[PDB]
Amino acid sequence: GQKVHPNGIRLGIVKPWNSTWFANTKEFADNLDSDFKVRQYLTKELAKASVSRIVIERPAKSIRVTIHTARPGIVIGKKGEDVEKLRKVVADIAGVPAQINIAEVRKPELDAKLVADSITSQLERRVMFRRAMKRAVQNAMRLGAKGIKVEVSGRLGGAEIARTEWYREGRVPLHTLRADIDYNTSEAHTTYGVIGVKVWIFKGEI
Amino acid sequence: AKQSMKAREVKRVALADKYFAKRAELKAIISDVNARWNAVLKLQTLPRDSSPSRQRNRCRQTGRPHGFLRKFGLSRIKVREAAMRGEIPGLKKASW
Amino acid sequence: TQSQDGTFDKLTKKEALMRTRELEKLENSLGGIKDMGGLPDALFVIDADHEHIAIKEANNLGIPVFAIVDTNSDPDGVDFVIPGNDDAIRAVTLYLGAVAATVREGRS
RNA sequence: GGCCGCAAGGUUAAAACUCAAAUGAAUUGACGGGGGCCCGCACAAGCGGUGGAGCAUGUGGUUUAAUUCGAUGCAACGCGAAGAACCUUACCUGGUCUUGACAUCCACGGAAGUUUUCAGAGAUGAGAAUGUGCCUUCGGGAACCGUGAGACAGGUGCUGCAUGGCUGUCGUCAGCUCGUGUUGUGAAAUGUUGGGUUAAGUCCCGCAACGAGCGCAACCCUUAUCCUUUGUUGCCAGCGGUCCGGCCGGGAACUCAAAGGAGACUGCCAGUGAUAAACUGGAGGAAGGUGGGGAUGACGUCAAGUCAUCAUGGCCCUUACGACCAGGGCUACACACGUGCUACAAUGGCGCAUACAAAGAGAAGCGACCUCGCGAGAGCAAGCGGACCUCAUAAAGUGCGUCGUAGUCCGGAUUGGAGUCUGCAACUCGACUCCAUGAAGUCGGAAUCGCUAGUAAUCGUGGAUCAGAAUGCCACGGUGAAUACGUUCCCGGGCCUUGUACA
C-alpha cells in the first residue's frame, strides 16, 4: 500500500549490509550476477536446514560465503558433504575460486525468515492459522524479542475475496529509523491462493 | 518478459560480437576516409543476421527491457528489489 | 535508577527537557504508595462530599472505612460512620492528630 | 341488519379472503440545502503562461494490409515508453521452422570447432573442406555438432472485480483502536470529552479515569559558520630563486579539497497569559522561537494501478493467443484539444574587447597541441586512466555603435537542393550545417492552471534513455522580484453538537 522496505532505508543506518563486495565499472554488473546464482541456489538445498542469510564479500578474486544458520548439524551432512560440493558451484557458474564459511546464529525461532518460514511450514502442514498464529506469535514473546508484528495474507479458510490479519504485540517502532528490524516476508503455497506472511521483529534499541 | 525472448536473447547478443569483434577490423580502412569500393560493401551485407545495433540491453536476472540501467546491468523494479534485499553493496536511498 | 544513580545524564538534554515532566507529576499522586507493598489493610476517607467518587469505589469491595461524613451526604455506604465537622481546617487536624498518637502502638 | 335522522349522514358492528408479520423504545453509524469550529497560494490581495495563433506530444477522429497495448472522473494523455528503420513488437504479412528457439529426457553417430564455394532476400540451404584435442584403467565419454522417437518445450495470452508482491489518492491531514476501571439488564459509552494552547491526540490546569501501543515529533542526509586532519593531480598569506607561471624552494598558510568535535535549549531576561505550557521583545551569533530543505506516508475507504515483468488460484492457442527470416508500420493528417517551449520587441539582425561559476563527465574512451571544414566536418591525436589529461570554462554583466518599436531592419515559417558526419541499414520514419528563400504573430476572447525568499520566474550547466534521435526529463551556476487584511464565497476538510419509516 504505502510503505518503504525496512531494510532498504536502514542499510545507510546502523543495520549493516547483508552482502558487501566491491569492484569497478565494467565488472560491476557481472559480480552481483554471480552473487545471485548462489543465493537462488543455496535455498534449494538448505531449505529445511533453517536458512537465515547469505553474506558475500570480495577480498581478492574470491568470495567469503558467510552462511548464517540455526540448524547446522544437518548443514554439514556426513562431515564433508558440503565443504567442497558447495565450493564446486561457485568456481564456474559464478566464476569465483572461493571458500565456504558456515556459521550458526542461535535462537532458531527468532530470525526473520525463521519466524516467517515456520508458519509456512505449519501452513504447508495446513494447520489452523487461528491455532498457528497465536502460538507462533508467542514463540517470540517466549525467548525475548521485544515486540512482534505478524500479518498473514488472505485466501484463508474458505473464501475467494478474503481479508488481512494482524497480531500487533509489544512494540514495533519501524517508522522511527533507529530500530534494527529483522524483517523478511515469505510465501506459502497452499493450493487455493498465495497465502503470504509479513513478519516484523524488533531486536532492541541501539 | 515475453518468455520466448529469452530464447532470442542469446541469439541476438552472442553472435553480434562473435562475428563483429574482428571482422570490423578486417574492413576498417575502406569505407572510412582513407582513399571506396563495393567488394567491402559485398563483404558488408552478404549475410544480414549479425547486428551489433540490435542489442536492446535486456535485464540480467529476469529480463525486462524497459528501465534498464547502465552501471547496474539491471532494470526498473530489479534495481529496487536488489537494493531492498541488500543484494547491491553500498547503496542507500539518495538524500542530501 | 536514573535518580539514585548518576545515570540521568544520558539521553541528551533536549530529551531531558520533557523527561522532568513525569518527574514533576509521577511523585504527586503516588506519594504513600512507593513504600507500600500490599493492599490497604484499612480505609480512611476524610470527607464524603468531595471524594464520594472514591467512596463509591471504596464500598464496592468491602473494606472498613473510618469516614467523617457531612450534614448533606449520601451516608449509607460507609458502615462505620461519623458526622463530624469535615470542613474548617482548624478542625480537620483535631481528628487526624487525635488518631495518630496511638497507631505506632497500634501494630504493637 | 337495525336504530336515531327531512336528508347529507352517524352510531352499533361482521365474514370469506390475504400476509409471517405489523410495532414500540433504544445505542452505534447512514443521508439532509441540522448547525457550529479552525486551518489550508482554499478563496481574496500578489504574479505569469495557458486557451488565439509559429509550434512538441499522445489521447485522438478518419487514414493504415498494421498505425499492438496499458492507462481513462479528477490521479488516462513529453514520464508506463528513462526513447520506434530492424530488434524492441506485443502489429501485419512475403519467407517459412515443426521435437523444434530452448530445456528436462534417452537413443545413435559425429570431438566440438575451423576454411570456403555455391544459391538465396536472408533464414534455410548444395555442401565440400577442416580437424579428431581432452577424460580415456580405450568398454565409454565431458560437451555440443545430427536426426530418428516421446513424455510435450513453447503463448508481452484472459479478470489485480481470485489473490502474492509492488502501487495512485485522501494525507504530513492528525488521526486511529486495545489491556485494566466503573457507570449501566444489556448492545455501548467513559479512555478520545472541558480551560485554552500549538504544525500537531503538542503540552499543561480541570479531568470518570489509570494505562499503554500506531501515528505528528527527534533518530537521519544535507547545507547556513568554527576548530582539529594534513598536504596530491590543488592552492601562495609570509619568505624568497623567479626564465611573474606555485614557475622553483618552502609553507599547511590564504583558500580549495574530505574525516571528525562544538554551538541552539524560548536557553537567558522582561512582559503576556491562571502563577500553566505556549508565546510577545531584548541580548548574542553565521544560527531563535520544530536553523532550513530533504528523507520518512498510521488504521485504512477506494472490485483503481502491473494477470504484459517475474510471480499468479482459474481459463486457455499446443504442425500453436507458437516458433523461425527478409521487410514494413507504430512518425498518414484533413485536424479537435491535455501540457510545454519560440515569438509578437521602451533591442533585434549584427559585428566587436575586458569579467568570472558550481555541478560534473571518460579505455568498444575523453579526445586535445596541431593541421583543418564556408559551416557542418576530415586528418594529427600528447596526456589522463582520471582536483594531472580530455571533456569545456560559459552566461545575462560591461566598453561600443548598429537599429526605432514599423510584419521588417521584430519574427520565424514554407518550398527546393550543396558539403561531410552517423550507422549494413533514414526516401517513406537520421539530425547538426554554408547561402538565398523573410509566412503565421503587434501579448491571444470566454476563461483556466500555477506559485510566499536566492521565492514565480529569467538566463547559464551536465546526466541518463543512448550505433546515431533532446524542445523535454533528471540534477547544478548567475541576476533578482510583487507582497500576506481576511475567512465572505468556493475547494478541501475535519472535528463538537441537531432532525428522517434510509442499511
mmCIF file of N, CA, C and O (backbone and C1' of nucleotides) in Angstrom, chain B residues 1-5 7-8 12 17 32-33 44-46 48-49 53-54 56 62 64-68 70 76-77 80 93 95-96, chain D residues 80-81 83 86-88 90 101 122-123 155-156 166-167 221-222 293 296 309-310 323-327 364 379 421 424 465 467:
data_model
loop_
_atom_site.group_PDB
_atom_site.id
_atom_site.type_symbol
_atom_site.label_atom_id
_atom_site.label_comp_id
_atom_site.label_asym_id
_atom_site.label_seq_id
_atom_site.Cartn_x
_atom_site.Cartn_y
_atom_site.Cartn_z
ATOM 1 N N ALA B 1 7.686 -10.819 -19.693
ATOM 2 C CA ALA B 1 9.013 -10.632 -20.258
ATOM 3 C C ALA B 1 9.048 -11.070 -21.709
ATOM 4 O O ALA B 1 10.077 -10.894 -22.370
ATOM 5 N N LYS B 2 7.915 -11.616 -22.186
ATOM 6 C CA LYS B 2 7.820 -12.357 -23.446
ATOM 7 C C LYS B 2 8.841 -13.488 -23.386
ATOM 8 O O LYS B 2 9.915 -13.392 -23.983
ATOM 9 N N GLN B 3 8.546 -14.513 -22.572
ATOM 10 C CA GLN B 3 9.492 -15.574 -22.209
ATOM 11 C C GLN B 3 10.176 -16.288 -23.378
ATOM 12 O O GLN B 3 11.218 -16.926 -23.199
ATOM 13 N N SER B 4 9.616 -16.191 -24.584
ATOM 14 C CA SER B 4 10.336 -16.663 -25.756
ATOM 15 C C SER B 4 11.416 -15.688 -26.215
ATOM 16 O O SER B 4 12.195 -16.028 -27.111
ATOM 17 N N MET B 5 11.483 -14.478 -25.650
ATOM 18 C CA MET B 5 12.638 -13.630 -25.938
ATOM 19 C C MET B 5 13.891 -14.115 -25.230
ATOM 20 O O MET B 5 15.000 -13.764 -25.634
ATOM 21 N N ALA B 7 14.807 -17.095 -25.332
ATOM 22 C CA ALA B 7 15.420 -17.797 -26.450
ATOM 23 C C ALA B 7 16.185 -16.832 -27.344
ATOM 24 O O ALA B 7 17.390 -16.995 -27.563
ATOM 25 N N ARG B 8 15.497 -15.804 -27.845
ATOM 26 C CA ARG B 8 16.073 -14.827 -28.762
ATOM 27 C C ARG B 8 16.993 -13.821 -28.080
ATOM 28 O O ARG B 8 17.466 -12.895 -28.748
ATOM 29 N N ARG B 12 20.541 -12.978 -30.285
ATOM 30 C CA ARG B 12 20.804 -11.629 -30.766
ATOM 31 C C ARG B 12 21.959 -10.959 -30.034
ATOM 32 O O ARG B 12 22.436 -9.912 -30.485
ATOM 33 N N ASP B 17 29.032 -9.969 -31.241
ATOM 34 C CA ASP B 17 30.464 -9.802 -31.036
ATOM 35 C C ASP B 17 31.254 -11.059 -31.367
ATOM 36 O O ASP B 17 32.486 -11.025 -31.382
ATOM 37 N N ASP B 32 35.900 4.053 -44.420
ATOM 38 C CA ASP B 32 36.459 5.198 -43.725
ATOM 39 C C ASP B 32 37.159 6.116 -44.727
ATOM 40 O O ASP B 32 37.530 5.704 -45.831
ATOM 41 N N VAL B 33 37.352 7.371 -44.327
ATOM 42 C CA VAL B 33 38.014 8.328 -45.204
ATOM 43 C C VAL B 33 39.505 8.033 -45.143
ATOM 44 O O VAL B 33 40.224 8.535 -44.270
ATOM 45 N N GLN B 44 30.176 -6.481 -46.665
ATOM 46 C CA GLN B 44 29.428 -5.879 -45.566
ATOM 47 C C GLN B 44 28.141 -6.637 -45.270
ATOM 48 O O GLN B 44 27.883 -7.007 -44.119
ATOM 49 N N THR B 45 27.321 -6.880 -46.287
ATOM 50 C CA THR B 45 25.999 -7.456 -46.078
ATOM 51 C C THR B 45 25.766 -8.611 -47.055
ATOM 52 O O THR B 45 24.791 -8.649 -47.811
ATOM 53 N N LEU B 46 26.708 -9.555 -47.100
ATOM 54 C CA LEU B 46 26.362 -10.806 -47.771
ATOM 55 C C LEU B 46 25.579 -11.735 -46.830
ATOM 56 O O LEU B 46 24.746 -12.503 -47.325
ATOM 57 N N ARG B 48 22.909 -11.107 -43.265
ATOM 58 C CA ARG B 48 22.261 -9.982 -42.590
ATOM 59 C C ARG B 48 22.188 -10.191 -41.078
ATOM 60 O O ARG B 48 22.347 -9.236 -40.307
ATOM 61 N N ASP B 49 22.036 -11.447 -40.637
ATOM 62 C CA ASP B 49 21.564 -11.770 -39.291
ATOM 63 C C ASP B 49 22.559 -11.455 -38.171
ATOM 64 O O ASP B 49 22.278 -11.811 -37.023
ATOM 65 N N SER B 53 23.923 -3.545 -33.485
ATOM 66 C CA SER B 53 22.974 -2.491 -33.159
ATOM 67 C C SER B 53 21.580 -3.098 -33.125
ATOM 68 O O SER B 53 20.635 -2.566 -33.718
ATOM 69 N N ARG B 54 21.464 -4.235 -32.444
ATOM 70 C CA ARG B 54 20.201 -4.937 -32.276
ATOM 71 C C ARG B 54 19.990 -5.217 -30.793
ATOM 72 O O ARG B 54 18.855 -5.400 -30.338
ATOM 73 N N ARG B 56 19.206 -4.595 -27.272
ATOM 74 C CA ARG B 56 18.398 -3.604 -26.573
ATOM 75 C C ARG B 56 18.748 -3.497 -25.098
ATOM 76 O O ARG B 56 18.097 -2.726 -24.381
ATOM 77 N N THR B 62 15.998 -11.377 -14.705
ATOM 78 C CA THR B 62 14.648 -11.726 -15.117
ATOM 79 C C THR B 62 14.292 -11.223 -16.505
ATOM 80 O O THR B 62 13.278 -11.665 -17.054
ATOM 81 N N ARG B 64 13.624 -7.875 -18.181
ATOM 82 C CA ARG B 64 12.648 -6.886 -18.618
ATOM 83 C C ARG B 64 13.354 -5.766 -19.370
ATOM 84 O O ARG B 64 14.352 -5.229 -18.867
ATOM 85 N N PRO B 65 12.898 -5.401 -20.585
ATOM 86 C CA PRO B 65 13.648 -4.431 -21.403
ATOM 87 C C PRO B 65 13.667 -2.999 -20.882
ATOM 88 O O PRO B 65 14.743 -2.402 -20.773
ATOM 89 N N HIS B 66 12.500 -2.442 -20.566
ATOM 90 C CA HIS B 66 12.406 -1.035 -20.199
ATOM 91 C C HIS B 66 13.036 -0.762 -18.838
ATOM 92 O O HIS B 66 13.115 -1.639 -17.974
ATOM 93 N N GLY B 67 13.498 0.476 -18.663
ATOM 94 C CA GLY B 67 14.036 0.913 -17.391
ATOM 95 C C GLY B 67 15.388 0.342 -17.031
ATOM 96 O O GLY B 67 15.761 0.367 -15.858
ATOM 97 N N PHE B 68 16.121 -0.183 -18.010
ATOM 98 C CA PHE B 68 17.450 -0.740 -17.790
ATOM 99 C C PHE B 68 18.430 0.346 -17.347
ATOM 100 O O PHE B 68 18.266 1.527 -17.667
ATOM 101 N N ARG B 70 22.663 1.557 -16.820
ATOM 102 C CA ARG B 70 23.987 1.412 -17.421
ATOM 103 C C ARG B 70 24.966 0.759 -16.453
ATOM 104 O O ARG B 70 25.580 -0.266 -16.769
ATOM 105 N N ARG B 76 14.239 -1.476 -13.964
ATOM 106 C CA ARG B 76 13.406 -0.608 -13.134
ATOM 107 C C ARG B 76 13.066 -1.161 -11.755
ATOM 108 O O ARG B 76 13.444 -0.587 -10.730
ATOM 109 N N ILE B 77 12.357 -2.288 -11.715
ATOM 110 C CA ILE B 77 11.961 -2.872 -10.439
ATOM 111 C C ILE B 77 13.022 -3.792 -9.844
ATOM 112 O O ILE B 77 12.948 -4.122 -8.654
ATOM 113 N N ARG B 80 15.504 -1.756 -7.673
ATOM 114 C CA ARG B 80 14.825 -1.542 -6.401
ATOM 115 C C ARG B 80 14.922 -2.774 -5.504
ATOM 116 O O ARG B 80 15.467 -2.702 -4.398
ATOM 117 N N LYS B 93 19.215 5.002 0.126
ATOM 118 C CA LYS B 93 18.350 5.963 -0.542
ATOM 119 C C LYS B 93 19.068 7.301 -0.645
ATOM 120 O O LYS B 93 19.700 7.749 0.316
ATOM 121 N N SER B 95 19.770 11.092 -0.546
ATOM 122 C CA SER B 95 19.234 12.185 0.254
ATOM 123 C C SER B 95 20.377 13.136 0.550
ATOM 124 O O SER B 95 21.453 12.688 0.949
ATOM 125 N N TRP B 96 20.154 14.427 0.344
ATOM 126 C CA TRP B 96 21.217 15.407 0.533
ATOM 127 C C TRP B 96 20.637 16.789 0.751
ATOM 128 O O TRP B 96 21.340 17.792 0.643
ATOM 129 P P G D 80 4.758 7.396 -19.650
ATOM 130 O "O5'" G D 80 5.719 6.138 -19.480
ATOM 131 C "C5'" G D 80 6.275 5.796 -18.222
ATOM 132 C "C4'" G D 80 5.791 4.447 -17.766
ATOM 133 C "C3'" G D 80 6.363 3.256 -18.521
ATOM 134 O "O3'" G D 80 7.607 2.835 -17.985
ATOM 135 C "C1'" G D 80 4.007 3.075 -18.422
ATOM 136 P P A D 81 8.643 1.969 -18.859
ATOM 137 O "O5'" A D 81 8.785 2.789 -20.213
ATOM 138 C "C5'" A D 81 9.622 3.936 -20.278
ATOM 139 C "C4'" A D 81 9.597 4.560 -21.649
ATOM 140 C "C3'" A D 81 8.819 5.865 -21.741
ATOM 141 O "O3'" A D 81 9.385 6.686 -22.759
ATOM 142 C "C1'" A D 81 7.774 4.224 -23.086
ATOM 143 P P G D 83 13.398 3.147 -21.718
ATOM 144 O "O5'" G D 83 12.709 4.036 -22.849
ATOM 145 C "C5'" G D 83 12.803 3.689 -24.225
ATOM 146 C "C4'" G D 83 12.280 4.800 -25.105
ATOM 147 C "C3'" G D 83 12.430 4.611 -26.608
ATOM 148 O "O3'" G D 83 11.445 3.764 -27.175
ATOM 149 C "C1'" G D 83 13.111 6.795 -26.018
ATOM 150 P P C D 86 11.596 -0.581 -36.542
ATOM 151 O "O5'" C D 86 12.105 -2.076 -36.742
ATOM 152 C "C5'" C D 86 11.923 -2.754 -37.978
ATOM 153 C "C4'" C D 86 13.005 -3.780 -38.198
ATOM 154 C "C3'" C D 86 13.253 -4.720 -37.030
ATOM 155 O "O3'" C D 86 12.373 -5.830 -37.043
ATOM 156 C "C1'" C D 86 15.324 -3.863 -37.830
ATOM 157 P P C D 87 11.349 -6.078 -35.833
ATOM 158 O "O5'" C D 87 12.294 -6.353 -34.585
ATOM 159 C "C5'" C D 87 13.190 -7.455 -34.587
ATOM 160 C "C4'" C D 87 14.190 -7.342 -33.470
ATOM 161 C "C3'" C D 87 13.615 -7.033 -32.099
ATOM 162 O "O3'" C D 87 13.109 -8.185 -31.443
ATOM 163 C "C1'" C D 87 15.478 -5.631 -32.513
ATOM 164 P P U D 88 11.528 -8.395 -31.230
ATOM 165 O "O5'" U D 88 11.153 -7.393 -30.049
ATOM 166 C "C5'" U D 88 11.830 -7.445 -28.799
ATOM 167 C "C4'" U D 88 11.992 -6.063 -28.225
ATOM 168 C "C3'" U D 88 10.701 -5.316 -27.944
ATOM 169 O "O3'" U D 88 10.109 -5.676 -26.705
ATOM 170 C "C1'" U D 88 12.170 -3.920 -29.156
ATOM 171 P P A D 90 6.030 -10.058 -31.891
ATOM 172 O "O5'" A D 90 5.013 -10.074 -30.663
ATOM 173 C "C5'" A D 90 3.710 -9.529 -30.799
ATOM 174 C "C4'" A D 90 3.139 -9.082 -29.476
ATOM 175 C "C3'" A D 90 1.879 -8.231 -29.557
ATOM 176 O "O3'" A D 90 0.692 -8.991 -29.713
ATOM 177 C "C1'" A D 90 3.426 -7.252 -28.038
ATOM 178 P P A D 101 15.493 -25.093 -33.971
ATOM 179 O "O5'" A D 101 15.354 -23.923 -32.896
ATOM 180 C "C5'" A D 101 15.733 -22.591 -33.212
ATOM 181 C "C4'" A D 101 15.662 -21.691 -32.003
ATOM 182 C "C3'" A D 101 16.228 -22.262 -30.715
ATOM 183 O "O3'" A D 101 17.634 -22.112 -30.647
ATOM 184 C "C1'" A D 101 14.150 -21.179 -30.296
ATOM 185 P P G D 122 20.878 -12.921 -49.419
ATOM 186 O "O5'" G D 122 21.034 -13.847 -48.131
ATOM 187 C "C5'" G D 122 21.638 -13.351 -46.947
ATOM 188 C "C4'" G D 122 20.665 -13.313 -45.798
ATOM 189 C "C3'" G D 122 20.446 -14.628 -45.065
ATOM 190 O "O3'" G D 122 21.447 -14.918 -44.106
ATOM 191 C "C1'" G D 122 18.356 -13.679 -45.589
ATOM 192 P P A D 123 22.019 -16.415 -43.979
ATOM 193 O "O5'" A D 123 20.715 -17.311 -43.799
ATOM 194 C "C5'" A D 123 20.527 -18.103 -42.634
ATOM 195 C "C4'" A D 123 19.150 -17.903 -42.052
ATOM 196 C "C3'" A D 123 18.397 -19.165 -41.670
ATOM 197 O "O3'" A D 123 18.766 -19.643 -40.390
ATOM 198 C "C1'" A D 123 16.971 -17.711 -42.888
ATOM 199 P P G D 155 6.479 -18.666 -24.317
ATOM 200 O "O5'" G D 155 5.190 -18.682 -25.249
ATOM 201 C "C5'" G D 155 4.959 -17.669 -26.214
ATOM 202 C "C4'" G D 155 3.505 -17.286 -26.230
ATOM 203 C "C3'" G D 155 2.957 -16.775 -24.902
ATOM 204 O "O3'" G D 155 3.168 -15.383 -24.706
ATOM 205 C "C1'" G D 155 1.560 -18.497 -25.707
ATOM 206 P P U D 156 3.795 -14.835 -23.326
ATOM 207 O "O5'" U D 156 2.853 -13.610 -22.924
ATOM 208 C "C5'" U D 156 3.396 -12.360 -22.501
ATOM 209 C "C4'" U D 156 2.848 -11.226 -23.331
ATOM 210 C "C3'" U D 156 3.156 -11.333 -24.820
ATOM 211 O "O3'" U D 156 2.052 -10.842 -25.579
ATOM 212 C "C1'" U D 156 4.043 -9.309 -23.977
ATOM 213 P P C D 166 5.176 -5.295 -0.702
ATOM 214 O "O5'" C D 166 5.229 -4.420 -2.031
ATOM 215 C "C5'" C D 166 6.467 -4.131 -2.669
ATOM 216 C "C4'" C D 166 6.256 -3.581 -4.058
ATOM 217 C "C3'" C D 166 5.510 -2.260 -4.147
ATOM 218 O "O3'" C D 166 6.315 -1.127 -3.888
ATOM 219 C "C1'" C D 166 4.601 -3.774 -5.706
ATOM 220 P P U D 167 5.699 0.111 -3.074
ATOM 221 O "O5'" U D 167 4.495 0.625 -3.986
ATOM 222 C "C5'" U D 167 4.755 1.375 -5.161
ATOM 223 C "C4'" U D 167 3.505 1.745 -5.922
ATOM 224 C "C3'" U D 167 2.556 2.706 -5.236
ATOM 225 O "O3'" U D 167 2.989 4.048 -5.338
ATOM 226 C "C1'" U D 167 1.335 0.949 -6.262
ATOM 227 P P C D 221 23.605 11.775 9.341
ATOM 228 O "O5'" C D 221 23.181 12.136 7.849
ATOM 229 C "C5'" C D 221 23.351 11.196 6.802
ATOM 230 C "C4'" C D 221 22.880 11.751 5.482
ATOM 231 C "C3'" C D 221 23.421 13.119 5.103
ATOM 232 O "O3'" C D 221 24.736 13.101 4.575
ATOM 233 C "C1'" C D 221 21.095 13.090 4.754
ATOM 234 P P U D 222 25.746 14.322 4.868
ATOM 235 O "O5'" U D 222 24.965 15.632 4.397
ATOM 236 C "C5'" U D 222 24.959 16.034 3.032
ATOM 237 C "C4'" U D 222 23.893 17.068 2.750
ATOM 238 C "C3'" U D 222 24.245 18.509 3.087
ATOM 239 O "O3'" U D 222 24.996 19.136 2.058
ATOM 240 C "C1'" U D 222 22.063 17.998 3.882
ATOM 241 P P G D 293 11.740 23.482 6.188
ATOM 242 O "O5'" G D 293 12.424 22.880 4.882
ATOM 243 C "C5'" G D 293 12.305 23.509 3.615
ATOM 244 C "C4'" G D 293 13.187 22.822 2.608
ATOM 245 C "C3'" G D 293 12.926 21.334 2.435
ATOM 246 O "O3'" G D 293 11.885 21.065 1.515
ATOM 247 C "C1'" G D 293 15.237 21.688 2.780
ATOM 248 P P U D 296 11.582 8.485 1.186
ATOM 249 O "O5'" U D 296 10.701 8.194 2.474
ATOM 250 C "C5'" U D 296 11.118 7.206 3.397
ATOM 251 C "C4'" U D 296 10.671 7.516 4.799
ATOM 252 C "C3'" U D 296 9.180 7.594 5.038
ATOM 253 O "O3'" U D 296 8.589 6.314 5.129
ATOM 254 C "C1'" U D 296 10.304 9.322 6.217
ATOM 255 P P U D 309 3.097 -7.897 -16.801
ATOM 256 O "O5'" U D 309 4.211 -8.527 -17.743
ATOM 257 C "C5'" U D 309 5.325 -7.755 -18.159
ATOM 258 C "C4'" U D 309 6.614 -8.317 -17.623
ATOM 259 C "C3'" U D 309 6.496 -9.555 -16.753
ATOM 260 O "O3'" U D 309 6.300 -10.751 -17.485
ATOM 261 C "C1'" U D 309 7.964 -8.016 -15.734
ATOM 262 P P C D 310 5.363 -11.903 -16.877
ATOM 263 O "O5'" C D 310 6.274 -12.596 -15.769
ATOM 264 C "C5'" C D 310 7.490 -13.241 -16.120
ATOM 265 C "C4'" C D 310 8.330 -13.535 -14.902
ATOM 266 C "C3'" C D 310 7.660 -14.378 -13.830
ATOM 267 O "O3'" C D 310 7.705 -15.766 -14.098
ATOM 268 C "C1'" C D 310 8.691 -12.498 -12.828
ATOM 269 P P A D 323 6.946 -16.953 -30.457
ATOM 270 O "O5'" A D 323 8.136 -17.861 -30.998
ATOM 271 C "C5'" A D 323 8.665 -18.942 -30.245
ATOM 272 C "C4'" A D 323 9.201 -20.011 -31.163
ATOM 273 C "C3'" A D 323 10.133 -19.514 -32.261
ATOM 274 O "O3'" A D 323 11.485 -19.419 -31.849
ATOM 275 C "C1'" A D 323 8.425 -20.802 -33.232
ATOM 276 P P C D 324 12.335 -18.109 -32.218
ATOM 277 O "O5'" C D 324 12.713 -18.299 -33.757
ATOM 278 C "C5'" C D 324 13.441 -19.431 -34.212
ATOM 279 C "C4'" C D 324 13.260 -19.629 -35.695
ATOM 280 C "C3'" C D 324 13.645 -18.442 -36.565
ATOM 281 O "O3'" C D 324 15.034 -18.385 -36.842
ATOM 282 C "C1'" C D 324 11.506 -19.230 -37.206
ATOM 283 P P C D 325 15.812 -16.980 -36.791
ATOM 284 O "O5'" C D 325 15.761 -16.447 -38.291
ATOM 285 C "C5'" C D 325 15.966 -15.074 -38.591
ATOM 286 C "C4'" C D 325 15.731 -14.798 -40.053
ATOM 287 C "C3'" C D 325 15.360 -13.370 -40.424
ATOM 288 O "O3'" C D 325 16.476 -12.503 -40.523
ATOM 289 C "C1'" C D 325 13.898 -14.877 -41.510
ATOM 290 P P A D 326 16.276 -10.909 -40.431
ATOM 291 O "O5'" A D 326 15.800 -10.480 -41.894
ATOM 292 C "C5'" A D 326 16.681 -10.577 -43.003
ATOM 293 C "C4'" A D 326 15.947 -10.476 -44.317
ATOM 294 C "C3'" A D 326 15.308 -9.132 -44.636
ATOM 295 O "O3'" A D 326 16.222 -8.169 -45.129
ATOM 296 C "C1'" A D 326 13.759 -10.846 -45.072
ATOM 297 P P G D 327 16.113 -6.639 -44.650
ATOM 298 O "O5'" G D 327 14.556 -6.307 -44.724
ATOM 299 C "C5'" G D 327 13.981 -5.823 -45.927
ATOM 300 C "C4'" G D 327 12.486 -5.649 -45.818
ATOM 301 C "C3'" G D 327 11.991 -4.482 -44.985
ATOM 302 O "O3'" G D 327 12.099 -3.233 -45.643
ATOM 303 C "C1'" G D 327 10.684 -6.396 -44.529
ATOM 304 P P A D 364 36.095 -0.537 -22.646
ATOM 305 O "O5'" A D 364 34.741 -0.352 -23.464
ATOM 306 C "C5'" A D 364 34.393 -1.234 -24.528
ATOM 307 C "C4'" A D 364 35.156 -0.928 -25.794
ATOM 308 C "C3'" A D 364 35.071 0.517 -26.288
ATOM 309 O "O3'" A D 364 36.297 0.855 -26.935
ATOM 310 C "C1'" A D 364 34.224 -0.925 -27.947
ATOM 311 P P G D 379 39.210 10.903 -40.854
ATOM 312 O "O5'" G D 379 40.683 11.327 -40.424
ATOM 313 C "C5'" G D 379 41.813 10.731 -41.040
ATOM 314 C "C4'" G D 379 42.915 11.732 -41.267
ATOM 315 C "C3'" G D 379 43.924 11.898 -40.142
ATOM 316 O "O3'" G D 379 44.908 10.880 -40.105
ATOM 317 C "C1'" G D 379 43.251 14.024 -40.895
ATOM 318 P P C D 421 31.957 11.183 -44.077
ATOM 319 O "O5'" C D 421 31.311 11.530 -42.659
ATOM 320 C "C5'" C D 421 32.107 11.972 -41.566
ATOM 321 C "C4'" C D 421 31.256 12.565 -40.467
ATOM 322 C "C3'" C D 421 30.535 11.575 -39.565
ATOM 323 O "O3'" C D 421 31.362 11.136 -38.499
ATOM 324 C "C1'" C D 421 29.033 13.284 -40.265
ATOM 325 P P C D 424 26.650 -0.785 -39.125
ATOM 326 O "O5'" C D 424 26.177 -0.445 -40.608
ATOM 327 C "C5'" C D 424 27.102 -0.469 -41.685
ATOM 328 C "C4'" C D 424 26.511 -1.115 -42.913
ATOM 329 C "C3'" C D 424 25.333 -0.400 -43.550
ATOM 330 O "O3'" C D 424 25.718 0.686 -44.371
ATOM 331 C "C1'" C D 424 24.860 -2.711 -43.382
ATOM 332 P P U D 465 21.663 4.516 -19.971
ATOM 333 O "O5'" U D 465 20.321 4.649 -20.811
ATOM 334 C "C5'" U D 465 19.136 4.007 -20.369
ATOM 335 C "C4'" U D 465 17.935 4.492 -21.133
ATOM 336 C "C3'" U D 465 18.009 4.329 -22.641
ATOM 337 O "O3'" U D 465 17.679 3.022 -23.073
ATOM 338 C "C1'" U D 465 17.258 6.512 -22.105
ATOM 339 P P A D 467 24.366 2.609 -27.843
ATOM 340 O "O5'" A D 467 24.869 3.215 -29.232
ATOM 341 C "C5'" A D 467 26.173 2.925 -29.726
ATOM 342 C "C4'" A D 467 26.324 3.291 -31.185
ATOM 343 C "C3'" A D 467 25.691 4.606 -31.613
ATOM 344 O "O3'" A D 467 26.515 5.726 -31.338
ATOM 345 C "C1'" A D 467 25.118 2.902 -33.157
#
